Amino acid sequence: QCVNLTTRTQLPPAYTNSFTRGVYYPDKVFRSSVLHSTQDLFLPFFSNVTWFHAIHVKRFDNPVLPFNDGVYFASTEKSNIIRGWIFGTTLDSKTQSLLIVNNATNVVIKVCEFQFCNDPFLGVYYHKNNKSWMESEFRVYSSANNCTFEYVSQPFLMDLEGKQGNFKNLREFVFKNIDGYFKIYSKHTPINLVRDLPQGFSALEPLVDLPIGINITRFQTLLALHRSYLTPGDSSSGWTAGAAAYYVGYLQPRTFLLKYNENGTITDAVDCALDPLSETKCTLK
C-alpha cells in the first residue's frame, strides 16, 4: 500500500550548533555533590548537527542517515509529527531491521525482517464535519517475516491535533548499539523557542536496553502527514506537512567531567579535550 511522495522542493541541508547538549547518565548509580569523570560515547560540545525541518508554508525531509557509533536525535514539536524511527543496514528485507513507532495508540518496537518502503510515513486526516483528527494511514513496511523481537506498550491516546503557534515540546534521544544491546536514553522538556536548539543543559535518563542483536549502520525518521480537504490530488500529492523540526548529531568516544548536584542531578558538564581550557578544567577537576 506504499506510495511515493512527489510534491517536494529540494533544499541544501541546514546545520545548527549544539551547545552543551546530549549528556546522559552513564550508569545507574546515585551520585550527589561530586565531580565525576567518565569516558563514554557522547555528543561533543559546541558541535555541528544536521537540521531537518518539516514545514508547508512544502519542505519536509526524512532521508536515510548514517548511524556512526550512536546518534543524538532532538525533536522540536507542537503537534506530534515525528513519531518513530527505522534502524538497520539495507532496509530491504535481506537483513533484520528495528522499527520503533508511536501510532497514536501504542508504542511498538519490532526487530524483524521488514521490506521497507522508499518513503515510509504515517498519516492523519482532518475532518471538516467535526473538529477531530484520527490517524488513518500506516505506510511504513510492505511485508514482515522471520520476526524476532516484539514489544507493544499499553494502549493510550495522544493529542494528534495540529496545533498553531510556537514549538512547545523538545524530545531528546540518545541511541547506541553496544554488545547486542540497543540502549535508548530519553528526555522531554517544555520549551517556547521558535527555530533552533535551545541553549542550556539537560541530562538524558536511561529508558530501555533492548536485546536486539542487530547490525545497525543506517537509520531513517518516520514523520506524520496531515491530509485535509484543503490538500487536493491523489495520495502522492494530496497532503500537507505540519510544522516540526529534528536535529541529528553523532556520538564519539569522549571523556566528560559531570557535576552531580546535591539532589543527584547532572546540572553541568565539561567536554574534555574540546579546547585546552577544558583540559585544564579536567586536570583541576
Partner: protein
C-alpha cells in the same frame, strides 16, 4: 555499618549510591521502597598514655 533514614531521592532506575571513593553510601531497601544511608560504625582516634 549503621543504617539510617535518608533524605536522598533516588531516580527509579537507581539502587545504590556511592562516594567519590566508590564505596556504597545509600541503598534503596528492596522490600520497602525507602533510601537508607550506610555509615561505617568504626570512628574516632584512640591514644594510650
Amino acid at each position: 555499618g549503621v543504617l539510617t533514614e535518608s533524605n536522598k531521592k533516588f531516580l527509579p532506575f537507581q539502587q545504590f549510591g556511592r562516594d567519590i571513593a566508590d564505596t556504597t553510601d545509600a541503598v534503596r531497601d528492596p522490600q520497602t521502597l525507602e533510601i537508607l544511608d550506610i555509615t561505617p560504625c568504626s570512628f574516632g582516634g584512640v591514644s594510650v598514655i
